[PDB]
Symmetry: D2
Subunit: 234 residues, 4 copies
């Protein structure tokens, strides 16, 4: 099975599998059952931004979600990620819907990785718009780019109405070398902006930024509450 | 056949096929017969640096090669590259040896691409050292990374002595989107540092930075004087 | 007197002093009488973007202005800027109004300078919003930042209505080293976004990005058609 | 008195004032008596690198010092720096000698600051060499740049032999805005490389990277063990 590190924006509480009884952001280390969570004042219909960062000296994975003119939500987890992840990874965004649904629209995405052992090795990309058929993305499941240059991670109709029972992911094409033996320091930083809109009283299921082994794929039975990341709820 | 734009550092003059009677840097648009050339005061055995840049407004492809404490060599060619290249490309370094030989050692390589249609789309990578089996490079022909973390584009012995009759290329794994319809401006910048050492009175054949269609491969019969780039000398 | 290199967005034609009979973008080398001009399809009331770039190998100063969903305007001038400018400069934006007026609102500004003689020396800044009293800007004349986090280079009223007879400039606080002896290559890149709105049939006078000697100041009698840059019309 | 946050590379143990009985790296919050320390396997005569990073979500200030082919030294301190520092700061390097001495040579220095409230405000600079009279640095006390393009923070002779009883500091010219009200996330990153050589059995006194209020100056009586940062030993 895949090795996954993720920051989930979980719009739908599945208390059955450990979710708190509210919308929340969480840090997932190798399991859908977050190591750390925080309550998320979800602003359905408004543009959000998520920012995630880590470095190997501090060993502290942190995430913040904010909307214009609102309180931010932060979560942090102390973890040595080079003991969790392989040296080469792909980074991606994932989203799902289930019985309940929402648009999982990514409007921009940027990522920087640095690895030092003069002078640091690095990878940086940014998308403020995604072309149709972006050749530097691996689109998995239902993921597509729409006519507006936005990434629709889950199925959306002609008008833009979200559909249930969907999974989609977008990975950056190039593997990233996130650690080496005798590296001095390695660090990464990711940001995305998202629009989550719904006709439903309870939107589902959420959006994640995740880091996995390079050949990662959507696991069988990972729909809905498993966010396209995990084959089970352990 | 591939679509190639290259800046060649041509160490060996093949007057037979248009080379001036001296070592030279050149700008190659779709043919080994450079559109523009300049005499290159080659410092065999010393670390060089090459820098290449372009933008779509200025439409002027420029390259400079320098060594510590020596005169630089510049070449420029006025060309609209978005009329030459496809929209998605891979960028690479190539080198050859023939009957005469030299090490074609790349010590570092960095590249930035920006495409604007807020806010610009971009790709940047840098290597100050290359791991063995770098997963973000496509190594073609004889190309390998050595124990020192340097890229050896052509065959080199245990001690580091160069071998003749060799071809090698290294492409960055992710395609780069270098143009779009209604783009405002698109630009790129590449730098590499190289060590060319030889036991021969005349080193051969040279090193290139090149931009090609994404599935580019080493053409049959492109050895020696064709620098791993072209199937013929037209 | 100051040494000025500028890209002017000239909204008001002063044929008296060399302006074409239309709104235009121009490249000004040491005089308000542009070395190169292009007709500018001014979209009064809409957000514009301007991008300017140069490098010392290509020796070609280029600028492009665009609005969402419209044709871009480009201008270029072949010039060796290291023969014009001192080695240390300040970079700024300037604007004026005269008898006729317009808002000269800067919404964002970013700049990168690189100087290579391993590894390149560099300066980069970006503002997507400007605080009140920005300590890293030198504000000259009427220039101020407003409550929205935008830079108002010329006087604007409580409601936001533009005022005539105004001059204002904003310089980045730190001098930039744009050339050195035996530099391999030096390059810069600047972008800004602007909103020019007017109640007048003919807006005036325009907005510039400029590069000058470090202690540059607004010259006596440089109002209106002289864009805050030049003491005279020679 | 100044507000100081610093990472000290303390070569000389002053147990009198809290130093451990060995060379150490430390995190200084508003006092020479470090909040956090780690033993430093000082490699006198060899080129070191120091890297320092912080972000406002993680709230963890971290530093690592390394030499080629040796074990790194890391230190971290949990601290909300936006409760310590003003919003606008200058960043600098400082060094001292006392009765015992060492060269405090800075070979390169780079710094990135980002402040987000689209899209983040930022400042980045890098020096791989320092010109004589660098106009973007404020040199305080004995600090100068030498003929090799290196920064000598303390007095050095014609041949390069270090002198005792010296203080010197180098600040970047532009203030940096490291926090704002309702910022989402703010982060910084600094790296420098240093050469500490000595004819003495015990080198003294060390080198710091520090962040202070903008008009910071070398305090009276801050020589030797106070590293040019503090007026007293409290
Ligand atoms: O999209 C919201 C959720 O829908 C389903 O779980 C249910 C949530 N409320 C229900 C009510 C009835 C039934 Br049957 C089911 Cl499966 C559910 C499942 O698809 C979950 O994976 C998902 O988290
Ligand atoms: O490496 C130098 C050159 O060697 C060969 O061309 C020759 C250069 N001098 C010669 C002398 C004799 C013969 Br046969 C040949 Cl093929 C050559 C060929 O391999 C060329 O492609 C290459 O440029
Ligand atoms: O703002 C537009 C222009 O206004 C003035 O020039 C005039 C343009 N039309 C006029 C009509 C009458 C008189 Br008087 C004047 Cl000065 C002008 C001057 O202030 C010019 O510097 C400026 O370019
Ligand atoms: O440079 C090393 C140290 O030298 C001095 O302190 C002493 C260290 N060993 C000593 C021995 C004798 C005397 Br007197 C003094 Cl002041 C010292 C002082 O200058 C200290 O500030 C500094 O840390
Ligand atoms: Ca859930
Ligand atoms: Ca040749
Ligand atoms: Ca005019
Ligand atoms: Ca000490
Ligand atoms: Mn959850
Ligand atoms: Mn980089
Ligand atoms: Mn694209
Ligand atoms: Mn960050
Ligand atoms: Mn409900
Ligand atoms: Mn040639
Ligand atoms: Mn970028
Ligand atoms: Mn690597
Ligand atoms: Mn460049
Ligand atoms: Mn010969
Ligand atoms: Mn004009
Ligand atoms: Mn830089
Ligand atoms: Mn600010
Ligand atoms: Mn550009
Ligand atoms: Mn008119
Ligand atoms: Mn100490
Ligand atoms: Mn930036
Ligand atoms: Mn300089
Ligand atoms: Mn870092
Ligand atoms: Mn001792």
């Amino acid at each position: 099975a895949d090795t996954i590190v993720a920051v989930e924006l979980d719009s739908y509480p599945n208390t059955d599998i450990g979710d708190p009884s509210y919308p929340h952001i969480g840090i997932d280390i190798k399991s859908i059952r977050s190591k750390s969570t925080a309550r998320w004042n979800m602003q359905t219909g408004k543009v959000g931004t998520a920012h995630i960062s880590y470095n190997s000296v501090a060993k502290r994975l942190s995430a913040v979600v904010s909307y214009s003119g609102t309180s931010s939500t932060t979560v942090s987890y102390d973890v040595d990620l080079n003991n969790v992840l392989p040296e080469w990874v792909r980074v991606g965004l994932s989203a799902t819907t289930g019985l309940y649904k929402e648009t999982n629209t990514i409007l921009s995405w940027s990522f920087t990785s640095k690895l030092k052992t003069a002078d640091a090795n690095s990878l940086h990309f940014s998308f403020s718009q995604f072309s149709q058929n972006p050749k530097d993305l691996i689109l998995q499941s239902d993921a597509t780019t729409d006519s507006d240059g936005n990434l629709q991670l889950t199925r959306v109709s002609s008008d833009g109405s979200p559909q249930g029972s969907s999974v989609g992911r977008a990975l950056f094409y190039a593997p990233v070398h996130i650690w080496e033996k005798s590296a001095v320091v390695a660090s990464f930083d990711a940001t995305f902006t998202f629009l989550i809109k719904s006709p439903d009283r309870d939107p589902a299921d959420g959006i994640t930024f995740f880091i996995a082994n390079t050949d990662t794929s959507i696991p069988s039975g990972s729909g809905g509450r498993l966010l396209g990341l995990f084959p089970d709820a352990n």
